């Protein structure tokens, strides 16, 4: 009767979203620098 063990091993199949979802998704969109996607043309330099 594996139809249960094989049908139960699937429990982790979708749970794969729950984990990534967790509470605050372990990632409150930190961004850090996503807005200004223009990271300048490597022309940094400064004085």
């Amino acid at each position: 009767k594996l139809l249960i063990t094989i049908h139960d091993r699937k429990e982790f199949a979708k749970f794969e979203e729950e984990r990534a979802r967790a509470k605050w998704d372990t990632a409150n969109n930190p961004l850090y620098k996503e807005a200004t996607s223009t990271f300048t043309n490597i022309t940094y330099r400064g004085t």
Binding site: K1, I4, H7
Partner: peptide, 20 residues
């Protein structure tokens, strides 16, 4: 056939499957 009907139908309709 077993847990399938008794795993996703109970939280909604205690039906089997074909009848959803």
């Amino acid at each position: 056939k077993v847990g399938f009907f008794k795993r996703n139908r109970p939280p909604l309709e205690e039906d089997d499957e074909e009848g959803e």
